[PDB]
Amino acid sequence: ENLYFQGMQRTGELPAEHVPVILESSGAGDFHLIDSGNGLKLEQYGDYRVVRPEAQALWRPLVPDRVWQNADAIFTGDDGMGRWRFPKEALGETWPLSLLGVEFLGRFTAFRHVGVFPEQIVHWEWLKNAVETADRPLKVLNLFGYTGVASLVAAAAGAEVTHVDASKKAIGWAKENQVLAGLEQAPIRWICEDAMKFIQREERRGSTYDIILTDPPKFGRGTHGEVWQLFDHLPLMLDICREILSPKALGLVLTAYSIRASFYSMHELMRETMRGAGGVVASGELVIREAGLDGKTPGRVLSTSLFSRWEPK
Amino acid sequence: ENLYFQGMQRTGELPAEHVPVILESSGAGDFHLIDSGNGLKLEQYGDYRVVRPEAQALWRPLVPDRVWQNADAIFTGDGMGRWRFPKEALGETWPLSLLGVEFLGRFTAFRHVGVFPEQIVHWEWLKNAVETADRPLKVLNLFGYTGVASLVAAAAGAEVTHVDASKKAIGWAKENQVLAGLEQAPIRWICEDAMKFIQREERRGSTYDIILTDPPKFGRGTHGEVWQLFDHLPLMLDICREILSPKALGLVLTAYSIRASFYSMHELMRETMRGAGGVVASGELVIREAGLDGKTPGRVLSTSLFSRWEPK
Amino acid sequence: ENLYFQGMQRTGELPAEHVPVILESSGAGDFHLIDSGNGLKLEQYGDYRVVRPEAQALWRPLVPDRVWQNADAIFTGDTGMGRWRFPKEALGETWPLSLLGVEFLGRFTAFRHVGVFPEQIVHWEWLKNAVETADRPLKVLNLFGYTGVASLVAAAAGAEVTHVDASKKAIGWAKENQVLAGLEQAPIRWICEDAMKFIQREERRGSTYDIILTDPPKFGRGTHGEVWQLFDHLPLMLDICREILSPKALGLVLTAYSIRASFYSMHELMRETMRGAGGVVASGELVIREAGLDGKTPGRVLSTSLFSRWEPK
Ligand SMILES: C[S@+](CC[C@H](N)C(=O)[O-])C[C@H]1O[C@@H](n2cnc3c(N)ncnc32)[C@H](O)[C@@H]1O
Numbered sequence: 001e002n003l004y005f006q007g008m009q010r011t012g013e014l015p016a017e018h019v020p021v022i023l024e025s026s027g028a029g030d031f032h033l034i035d036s037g038n039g040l041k042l043e044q045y046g047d048y049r050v051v052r053p054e055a056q057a058l059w060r061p062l063v064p065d066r067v068w069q070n071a072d073a074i075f076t077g078d079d080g081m082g083r084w085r086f087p088k089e090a091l092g093e094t095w096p097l098s099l100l101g102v103e104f105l106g107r108f109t110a111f112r113h114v115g116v117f118p119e120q121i122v123h124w125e126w127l128k129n130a131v132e133t134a135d136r137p138l139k140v141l142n143l144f145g146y147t148g149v150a151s152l153v154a155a156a157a158g159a160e161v162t163h164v165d166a167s168k169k170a171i172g173w174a175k176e177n178q179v180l181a182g183l184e185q186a187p188i189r190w191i192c193e194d195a196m197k198f199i200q201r202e203e204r205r206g207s208t209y210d211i212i213l214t215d216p217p218k219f220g221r222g223t224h225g226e227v228w229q230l231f232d233h234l235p236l237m238l239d240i241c242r243e244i245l246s247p248k249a250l251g252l253v254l255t256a257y258s259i260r261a262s263f264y265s266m267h268e269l270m271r272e273t274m275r276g277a278g279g280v281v282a283s284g285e286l287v288i289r290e291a292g293l294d295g296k297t298p299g300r301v302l303s304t305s306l307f308s309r310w311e312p313k
Numbered sequence: 314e315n316l317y318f319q320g321m322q323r324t325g326e327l328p329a330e331h332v333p334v335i336l337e338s339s340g341a342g343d344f345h346l347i348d349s350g351n352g353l354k355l356e357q358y359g360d361y362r363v364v365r366p367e368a369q370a371l372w373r374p375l376v377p378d379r380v381w382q383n384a385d386a387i388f389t390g391d392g393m394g395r396w397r398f399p400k401e402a403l404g405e406t407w408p409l410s411l412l413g414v415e416f417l418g419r420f421t422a423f424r425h426v427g428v429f430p431e432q433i434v435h436w437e438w439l440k441n442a443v444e445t446a447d448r449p450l451k452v453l454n455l456f457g458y459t460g461v462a463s464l465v466a467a468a469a470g471a472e473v474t475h476v477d478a479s480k481k482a483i484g485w486a487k488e489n490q491v492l493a494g495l496e497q498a499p500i501r502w503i504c505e506d507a508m509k510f511i512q513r514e515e516r517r518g519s520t521y522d523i524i525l526t527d528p529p530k531f532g533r534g535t536h537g538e539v540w541q542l543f544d545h546l547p548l549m550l551d552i553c554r555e556i557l558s559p560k561a562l563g564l565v566l567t568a569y570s571i572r573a574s575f576y577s578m579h580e581l582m583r584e585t586m587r588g589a590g591g592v593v594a595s596g597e598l599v600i601r602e603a604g605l606d607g608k609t610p611g612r613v614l615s616t617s618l619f620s621r622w623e624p625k
Numbered sequence: 626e627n628l629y630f631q632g633m634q635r636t637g638e639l640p641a642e643h644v645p646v647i648l649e650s651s652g653a654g655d656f657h658l659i660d661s662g663n664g665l666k667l668e669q670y671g672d673y674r675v676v677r678p679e680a681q682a683l684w685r686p687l688v689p690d691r692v693w694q695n696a697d698a699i700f701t702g703d704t705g706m707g708r709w710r711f712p713k714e715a716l717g718e719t720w721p722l723s724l725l726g727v728e729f730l731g732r733f734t735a736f737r738h739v740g741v742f743p744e745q746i747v748h749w750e751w752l753k754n755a756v757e758t759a760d761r762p763l764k765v766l767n768l769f770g771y772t773g774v775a776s777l778v779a780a781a782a783g784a785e786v787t788h789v790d791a792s793k794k795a796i797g798w799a800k801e802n803q804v805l806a807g808l809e810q811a812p813i814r815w816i817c818e819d820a821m822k823f824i825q826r827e828e829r830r831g832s833t834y835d836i837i838l839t840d841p842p843k844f845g846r847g848t849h850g851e852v853w854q855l856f857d858h859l860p861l862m863l864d865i866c867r868e869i870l871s872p873k874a875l876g877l878v879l880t881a882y883s884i885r886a887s888f889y890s891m892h893e894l895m896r897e898t899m900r901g902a903g904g905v906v907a908s909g910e911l912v913i914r915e916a917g918l919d920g921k922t923p924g925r926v927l928s929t930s931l932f933s934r935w936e937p938k
């Protein structure tokens with residue numbers, strides 16, 4: 001029961017809604033899902049073919065064994081930490097990739113992650129369009145920014161970006177992507193801090209942003225050990241986000257992975273957060289479709305994450 | 314069963330005893346307990362009113378919910394958590410003063426705010442012991458934490474050795490030293506397992522006039538040494554005795570996590586001090602609620618055990 | 626079940642086998658096992674008499690209580706971090722030792738381990754002989770090298786040594802031993818890396834070694850958090866080791882403290898790994914025999930570890 005992190009009461013009427021909205025990613029170029037099944041997925045990231053666990057890929061693989069057995073890297077093991085197997089000669093920590101004009105690194109760590117969630121291109125497209133068509137310089141806030149591809153998309157489009165992540169290591173990775181992308185001179189502020197602390201302090205300062213993106217994990221830790229738990233804390237976070245939106249704000253975008261909840265729960269939370277603000281809240285799932293070996297052969301849907309987006313419409 | 318951490322054999326009579334002794338504080342300073350109940354407590358720390366869990370505060374709160382809700386900071390979660398700041402975001406630290414010593418309250422990911430204000434009773438004993446001493450005194454403060462006792466002793470003119478296994482905690486204590494204006498005071502900062510340090514002091518023939526020790530139920534030395542109060546305390550107290558000066562003024566043991574009785578601490582202390590004369594006083598250290606006005610005595614909240622040997 | 630870490634299929638005949646081979650050390654010079662029983666052991670390491678837990682010492686102690694009660698240090702256990710008791714007086718962190726001509730430090734940490742496995746002298750003797758009777762300087766690889774006494778034995782004998790350990794702290798200890806042993810100028814290359822990642826990279830580089838020693842724990846962690854689990858990963862490890870043996874290799878030596886397995890399981894793994902390579906695989910247990918107080922007095926066997934050794938013999 002939420003005692004201390006409740007959203008504040010707002011006046012006015014709930015915004016309009018579009019729900020469910022299923023967003024489906026196209027590859028993308030350097031990424032496609034080749035095949036999946038038996039609790040695994042087979043993905044192409046540029047020159048690297050990778051096998052990773054995907055528990056919900058319950059069905060049987062449709063692409064021949066020979067294609068799976070030609071993978072460059074296979075993630076194995078059971079905390080979250082495991083071991084990559086490299087069955088041929090592909091090796092080192094990193095490899096270059098590009099999505100939506102932004103060059104960044106795929107990276108093998110002890111975790112199953114590869115340094116990008118390429119399905120998020122659908123949201124980066126929304127972001128890029130919003131920045132490049134705005135007739136004024138925009139401020140974009142990116143919370144839980146990870147390897148920073150959204151930050152770089154926004155920076156490349158002309159935004160003044162503030163990227164927030166509690167992990168100094170992840171900030172380092174994002175900065176490496178910034179160099180690779182040729183965006184060293186772009187206005188990106190790198191904030192290594194707990195995300196909710198940063199925004200509450202921004203609220204106290206009276207700071208505002210035109211677009212806020214937020215990608216909270218189910219569980220996290222702030223830079224000074226502050227426990228983050230999505231189901232305990234999200235209502236306060238979104239409330240503070242609204243308090244730091246500019247009068248002419250273009251959007252508030254929430255993405256959520258790996259969570260025992262429907263998009264309807266993100267949706268109704270977002271609708272209530274934005275009570276009296278007008279506009280429209282669109283929510284649902286973000287999915288990838290299998291594309292086969294050639295990348296042109298549509299197959300099954302693999303749902304990755306939830307989203308809810310407010311816009312002034 | 315304790316096989317390897319037994320105290321040495323002693324001769325003579327057990328010291329005199331005063332037991333139970335209940336030591337009480339009510340916060341006539343930058344601290345008081347406002348209210349408690351339903352497994353929580355409402356406290357004033359200087360400019361901030363804070364709400365923290367207190368599982369043994371089983372009774373019902375006497376101050377209206379509206380007041381608790383109005384707190385500046387609430388500690389939440391299941392040991393790490395998250396502080397909620399309902400009015401507006403608060404900075405990490407805020408200045409406090411107790412017994413003439415200025416130090417920092419601190420919001421960390423834990424429930425601890427950087428001070429145990431009830432310990433002012435033991436600080437007052439210490440302050441008096443040092444002040445009224447004819448001679449310069451050597452004070453050892455084991456498991457010293459944020460070091461308010463170290464600063465009290467330094468301010469009274471003692472030569473202080475502060476021992477804590479945590480470099481982070483030493484850092485906080487040093488920050489307090491600076492804020493308190495005690496940078497030129499003789500405080501030696503030792504980052505080491507406490508029992509290792511005192512056994513090495515014994516080997517060196519070092520002595521101290523006053524020893525305070527605040528061991529946790531479980532801890533870890535600077536180099537991973539496992540500390541467990543019920544396995545190791547008998548040996549620690551025995552070594553403490555071995556490093557007391559001939560004219561020592563006291564040995565003070567404080568113990569949180571109040572599962573064992575003060576009687577156990579008491580019988581162990583008394584036996585450790587066999588043949589040393591003086592008196593062992595033991596019991597609990599408690600805070601009494603003071604209400605919104607700080608002047609309305611309420612319920613007792615017991616925080617810790619203590620046992621103190623003095624030549625008294 | 627092993628899906629991703631199988632050794633390649635080999636053709637040809639399994640090497641000859643000698644099994645069980647029980648290797649026994651009675652402790653010379655600075656080490657011997659005085660007595661053991663009641664789940665404890667009483668050992669002399671140079672000038673210190675030490676008591677440590679030894680759960681399999683189920684029998685009774687045969688040396689009087691007085692002698693045990695005169696110990697300089699006793700390890701007392703939460704299980705495996707604990708606390709050393711020094712009953713006579715506080716002991717410093719380290720003390721000088723020497724075995725097989727190599728000077729190194731005994732060390733009190735929060736674990737039961739004193740900085741050397743002196744029973745390993747039997748394998749060090751095999752190694753010393755192999756290096757010092759060779760007609761060329763041998764390349765010796767030592768995986769999971771710990772405090773590096775084997776590395777120092779090989780280097781003293783004239784080998785070019787590569788020492789691999791994921792722990793920077795352990796590498797630091799080994800280097801301290803190198804200094805103490807007077808081997809600072811010797812060709813020892815200190816590698817702080819996951820052992821399997823290092824050897825796969827060696828394989829890619831086409832590198833070879835004349836002798837390979839590997840002492841994998843049941844469970845470990847690479848420098849960059851890679852999970853090591855002997856039962857999941859050892860088959861691939863040994864196969865890569867084979868691929869980095871020189872044509873004129875003198876041996877591949879596996880040691881394992883995972884006592885629960887039989888030496889037969891290390892044996893058959895090593896035999897199959899070396900299929901078609903000729904030579905001989907000898908496997909069994911490495912044991913210490915109690916030496917008692919005075920005279921060299923043969924007592925009970927304390928088995929410490931498993932081993933399997935391939936040689937071209
Ligand atoms: C942890 S999530 C990982 C990706 C995706 N959102 C998911 O849940 O799988 C994205 C980023 O959030 C960061 N993070 C976790 N807790 C945080 C916190 N309390 N404040 C700021 N960033 C945090 C992580 O360091 C990471 O780079």
Ligand SMILES: C[S@+](CC[C@H](N)C(=O)[O-])C[C@H]1O[C@@H](n2cnc3c(N)ncnc32)[C@H](O)[C@@H]1O
Pocket residue numbers: 455456457458459476477478479482505506507508527528529530531532533534535538539540569570
């Ligand atoms: C951990 S206790 C916490 C306060 C109070 N004594 C309690 O138990 O709740 C006080 C200090 O003991 C220190 N400490 C814990 N184990 C220690 C050890 N083995 N040696 C020296 N200091 C230790 C901690 O770093 C901390 O600052």
Ligand SMILES: C[S@@+](CC[C@H](N)C(=O)[O-])C[C@H]1O[C@@H](n2cnc3c(N)ncnc32)[C@H](O)[C@@H]1O
Pocket residue numbers: 768769770771772789790791792795818819820821840841842843844845846847848851852853882883
């Ligand atoms: C095997 S462990 C301890 C000694 C003995 N083998 C045992 O299991 O009890 C020996 C060394 O392996 C190292 N180690 C553990 N995991 C490793 C890894 N993944 N790669 C390289 N070294 C590792 C440790 O740092 C340690 O110094």
